[PDB]
Design a protein around this ligand. Structure first.
Ligand code: MG
Ligand code: MG
Ligand code: MG
Ligand code: MG
Ligand code: MG
Ligand code: MG
Ligand code: MG
Ligand code: MG
Ligand code: MG
Ligand code: MG
Ligand code: MG
Ligand code: MG
Ligand code: MG
Ligand code: MG
Ligand code: MG
Ligand code: MG
Ligand code: MG
Ligand code: MG
Ligand code: MG
Ligand code: MG
Ligand code: MG
Ligand code: MG
Ligand code: MG
Ligand code: MG
Ligand code: MG
Ligand code: MG
Ligand code: MG
Ligand code: MG
Ligand code: MG
Ligand code: MG
Ligand code: MG
Ligand code: MG
Ligand code: MG
Ligand code: MG
Ligand code: MG
Ligand code: MG
Ligand code: MG
Ligand code: MG
Ligand code: MG
Ligand code: MG
Ligand code: MG
Ligand code: MG
Lengths: 260, 67, 179, 144, 60
RNA sequence: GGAUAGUGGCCUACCAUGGUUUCAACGGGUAACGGGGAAUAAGGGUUCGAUUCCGGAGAGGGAGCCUGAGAAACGGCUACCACAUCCAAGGAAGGCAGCAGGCGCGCAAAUUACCCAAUCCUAAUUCAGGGAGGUAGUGACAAUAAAUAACGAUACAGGGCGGUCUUGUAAUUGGAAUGAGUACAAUGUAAAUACCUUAACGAGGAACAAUUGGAGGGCAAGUCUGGUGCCAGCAGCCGCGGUAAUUCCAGCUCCAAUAGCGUAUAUUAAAGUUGUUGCAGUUAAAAAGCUCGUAGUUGAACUUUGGGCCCGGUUGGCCG
RNA sequence: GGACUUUUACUUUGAAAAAAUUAGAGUGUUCAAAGCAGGCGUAUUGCUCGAAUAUAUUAGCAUGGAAUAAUAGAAUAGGACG
């Protein structure tokens, strides 16, 4: 259509973004960056809808232009910045630090973390191959490339990053029985640590996941993100820890806390 | 009557993070007016039809009084 | 370019338009509950039939089907929540039988009169519309309130209304002060 | 089996058979061939404005015996000419031939409605204004 | 058949009907009040059963 | 091989003779953009989607091309065709299927108004710009809620069983209530407007006065009065009027729906009159004069049944 | 990893799966059409639940079933195992 579309009408924005229908006619188009458009969340949304920190969108930019916000490190003042899954949003003011993790319903939730935990982050390696003058590199979910990785570091494995510098410290692997996090479809949010993989040469290897509730489910490989050892994660999980409460289960215990 | 409001840690913070229409709704920012939006739009086009300062052309307009 | 503000209508209409039996019944119902247009009856028949095909649909589901239970107890819960379906009839086989009149007697112009205080269903409607009677301080002029059976305890007039009194009233102050 | 094949792979035959037999439906064929636009002088539209050529009086059909007052009008958007009834006592004093009027059908799918031989349209407003409103003296006929 | 019948009679009877003028009456009630009035007139005091009901007997 | 960003008859050279089709090719039509979807509610269906989201195409019709990351762009250029403006006659300039607004067309559709406050977008970029967008106007498109009244006392009257319980029908009464409107004010808003609050006003029949159809049948509501006299007119259909008109024109009374109601056209149910579910074919519409017969549809029966062991699941009962 | 696999139709479950629409939960927009809000205290400097579920169904993908209905297999043995 002659080029790049730089707008985003409402009702076209991701549903997990939780945007009210009548708020004018357009949504904020996420920018180009580390995370895929349909697989991200921008700062305007975070600072306005999720945290209710800014009333208008006009105020959000006033907030950012003071370098108050930083993500995974640097300031990152792009109002439409595509902050994605596992990113770390620190905040000079309020001492707050946040990690971007989903719910079991599939949306990004507000999850505060320790100043200690804000120093690291993980990433699902999406590609590994040699490059410039024979030096191998790794590229992952993040959208960052790390030179000189360990020869055992294969694809689809998670990795821990310092974020003060670039080099990684630990690298979990995609082996039977490792903590996983589903990011894809709407099984997204469920967690459970591996059942087994169906290769299916030609494409779309499938992963079998068993939550720690004796409940099975399946998803596609590029949707699973290993996070560690059974019961032993590598990051602070959110409330409910992804176990797919049924509609009746959540309503029952919704009426459980009955008296004020 | 339900509403919404806010108090600042100073007035210099309010006068800088607060919308100007509010500052004038209070009387802490003057209401000095500006010409109608369509008027200045027309002025913009009127100005685009001129290339340069426009000071050296009044010369020829007033210089063709002979011709 | 902007989201479509959803809408829907609340009143169906009988196919046969000149059935004298149903017409006579309809009229007495209107004249009894204080209705003004017969369509406030057509309306109640509409939501009724909707609830009925929503229940009757689940009634052929294999007994105890998960969504059947969830939405079944949800439906009975909100019906008792308003006070139309008796508490003994909480297993939904009686929801197919909620005769229309049960809904009407659970309106607000109806209760405003039933707990005395209006001495006519028409005086009731007139008062509800004239700045009078509230639940708390929440004045309500919608005679089709559909009181929830719990807010049914607090129906005393609002503070303002010069009928439980806050002032004499506009026509009174002068009907008497015109000397 | 009395005809229609019941095999599980005769769907093509069943669908084409009904497609072919649906032509026996007048409504279906009318809507398909498009007679509404070719024939039926109105362009298929709800109403059509025209000009009055003459003021005729049609002998009623039997067993009736009257004189139905109508007008021959030439549709302005198409130029076709059709005879349409000006209904109600009088209303022929209001036509004033070479005036501008609007025509509507008779609610019979063409098929001229009563004892008026071959007339499938009626007048609604002359000089563009509310013929029945002229009947009942709510409005008045314009200067021309 | 013939299509050029005369047209002198257009509006003949509406023209010659001696038009009686309507007579002033009371201002009747609206929807709730009116349909209530009908509820009463039809179901509170049936005015007649010498056979069955009749909603508009002129000479009965 | 050339060309492309790159695959490819994309193009060229050489060579060959292939490719689709009754399982409908090829051609024609379309009052055809496709889709998310809309209407109609037993179900199966039938019918519509220009139009708020997604995709595509176009900018009067064609073609060509500069810039560039990205355009065969048109609120860019070049040419031709059509349209068409200014002029000093030499020449020059234009492209609203953007916002409004105008002509025409027609059955058919609103202001040449306000703002970047919101929603978002762009730039060198917190600032500027944005007829995107938002405000108001116009607006019975459709959709929601629902005023035009409510209580008395009395008075003959009924009926309860004139008394004291009201059925109320009353042509004098009666003090109560309120918004439709009007308007300090605050709120509302970018600034206004409305809505939400609320002082002062603001209802008795002259009103703040509901309509639109209909009253022979279908089909609810008069064989009342006047008129007319196969005339005028009514009448979706059956039928009314030729001198007491249950139908026309009216007065009266009545019915249905009621801030809405009638009419025209289309469509859907009704329609088991398109029938897969689910029609009909002796005589009512319909079995080729007859047999062969390719496509198509359909096509008898028979191959590991039966018996034994184990595990652990889910309801429900007796217990709790 | 190697060596080799008669072909189908059907049915199960699941993934993939835009939003609005629709069905539908919760929430008392004064009711309602709607909206996705909202509900709580210490209303002095905060506490807190949400923003479900369903739905796609033709085709493609993945998986269990082996009835029904096809296709192929050893007859000039040019068969099968070694
Ligand atoms: Mg952006
Ligand atoms: Mg400007
Ligand atoms: Mg300049
Ligand atoms: Mg034929
Ligand atoms: Mg002629
Ligand atoms: Mg034309
Ligand atoms: Mg070649
Ligand atoms: Mg050849
Ligand atoms: Mg064919
Ligand atoms: Mg077209
Ligand atoms: Mg049909
Ligand atoms: Mg479309
Ligand atoms: Mg279409
Ligand atoms: Mg068109
Ligand atoms: Mg589009
Ligand atoms: Mg284009
Ligand atoms: Mg044009
Ligand atoms: Mg051409
Ligand atoms: Mg172009
Ligand atoms: Mg333009
Ligand atoms: Mg453009
Ligand atoms: Mg000259
Ligand atoms: Mg325009
Ligand atoms: Mg219109
Ligand atoms: Mg605009
Ligand atoms: Mg606009
Ligand atoms: Mg009025
Ligand atoms: Mg009055
Ligand atoms: Mg009338
Ligand atoms: Mg009748
Ligand atoms: Mg006949
Ligand atoms: Mg006589
Ligand atoms: Mg007579
Ligand atoms: Mg008579
Ligand atoms: Mg009459
Ligand atoms: Mg109707
Ligand atoms: Mg079937
Ligand atoms: Mg038949
Ligand atoms: Mg015969
Ligand atoms: Mg034969
Ligand atoms: Mg033959
Ligand atoms: Mg067989």
């Amino acid at each position: 259509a002659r080029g790049p579309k730089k707008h985003l009408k409402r009702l076209a924005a991701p549903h997990h973004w939780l945007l009210d229908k009548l708020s004018g006619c357009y949504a904020p188009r996420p920018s180009a960056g580390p995370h895929k458009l349909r697989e991200s969340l921008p700062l305007i949304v975070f600072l306005r809808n999720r945290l209710k920190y800014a009333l208008n969108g006009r105020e959000v930019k006033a907030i950012l232009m003071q370098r108050h916000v930083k993500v995974d490190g640097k300031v990152r003042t792009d109002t439409t910045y595509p902050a994605g899954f596992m990113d770390v949003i620190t905040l000079d003011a309020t001492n707050e630090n946040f990690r971007l993790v989903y719910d079991v319903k599939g949306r990004f939730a507000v999850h505060r973390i320790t100043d200690e935990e804000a120093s690291y982050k993980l990433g699902k390696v999406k590609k590994v191959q040699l490059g410039k003058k024979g030096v191998p590199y790794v590229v992952t979910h993040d959208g960052r490339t790390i030179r000189y990785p360990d020869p055992n570091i294969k694809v689809n494995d998670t990795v821990k990053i310092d974020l003060a510098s670039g080099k990684i410290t630990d690298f979990i692997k995609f082996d039977a029985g490792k903590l996983v996090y589903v990011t894809g479809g709407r099984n997204l949010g469920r967690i459970g640590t591996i059942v087994h993989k169906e290769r299916h040469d030609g494409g779309f290897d499938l992963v079998h996941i068993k939550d720690s509730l004796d409940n099975t489910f399946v998803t596609r490989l590029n949707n699973v993100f290993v996070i560690g050892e059974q019961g032993k994660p590598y990051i602070s999980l959110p409330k409910g820890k992804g176990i797919k409460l049924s509609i009746a289960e959540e309503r029952d215990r919704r009426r459980a806390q009955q008296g004020l | 009557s339900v509403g919404f409001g806010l108090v600042y840690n100073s007035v210099a913070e309010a006068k800088k993070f607060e919308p100007t229409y509010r500052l004038v709704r209070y009387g802490l920012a003057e209401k000095v007016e500006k010409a109608s939006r369509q008027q200045r739009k027309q002025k913009k086009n009127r100005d685009k039809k001129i290339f340069g300062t426009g000071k050296r052309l009044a010369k020829k307009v007033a210089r063709r009084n002979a011709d | 370019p902007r989201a479509p503000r959803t809408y829907s209508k609340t009143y169906s209409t009988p196919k046969r338009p000149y059935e004298s039996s149903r017409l006579d019944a309809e009229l007495k119902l209107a004249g009894e509950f204080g209705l003004k247009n017969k369509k406030e009856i057509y309306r109640i028949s509409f939501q009724l039939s909707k609830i009925r095909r929503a229940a009757r649909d689940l009634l052929t589901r294999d007994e105890k089907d998960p969504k059947r239970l969830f939405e079944g107890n949800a439906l009975i819960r909100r019906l008792v929540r308003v006070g139309v379906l008796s508490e003994d009839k909480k297993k939904l086989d009686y929801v197919l039988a909620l005769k229309v009149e049960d809904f009407l007697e659970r309106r607000l112009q109806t209760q405003v009169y039933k707990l005395g205080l209006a001495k006519s269903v028409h005086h009731a409607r007139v008062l509800i519309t004239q700045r009078h009677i509230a639940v708390g301080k929440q004045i309500v002029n919608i005679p089709s309130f559909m009181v929830r059976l719990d807010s049914e305890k607090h129906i005393d007039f609002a503070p303002t209304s010069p009928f439980g009194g806050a002032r004499p009233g506009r026509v009174a102050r002068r009907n008497a002060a015109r000397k | 089996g009395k005809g229609k094949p019941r095999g599980l792979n005769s769907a093509r035959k069943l669908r084409v058979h009904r497609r072919n037999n649906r032509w026996a439906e007048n409504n279906y064929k009318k809507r398909l061939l498009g007679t509404a636009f070719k024939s039926s002088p109105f362009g298929g539209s709800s109403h059509a404005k025209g000009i009055v050529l003459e003021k005729l009086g049609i002998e009623s059909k039997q067993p009736n015996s009257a004189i139905r007052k109508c007008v021959r009008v030439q549709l302005i958007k198409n130029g076709k000419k059709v005879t349409a009834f000006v209904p109600n006592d009088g209303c022929l004093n209001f036509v004033d031939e070479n005036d501008e009027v609007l025509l509507a059908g008779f609610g019979r799918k063409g098929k001229a409605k009563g004892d008026i031989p071959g007339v499938r349209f009626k007048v609604v407003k002359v000089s563009g204004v509310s013929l029945l409103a002229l009947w009942k003296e709510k409005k008045e006929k314009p200067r021309s | 058949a013939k299509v050029h019948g005369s047209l002198a009679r257009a509006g003949k009877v509406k023209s010659q009907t001696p038009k009686v003028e309507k007579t002033e009456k009371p201002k009747k009630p609206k929807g709730r009040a009116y349909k209530r009035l009908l509820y009463t007139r039809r179901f509170v005091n049936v005015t007649l059963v010498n056979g069955k009901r009749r909603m508009n007997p002129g000479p009965s």
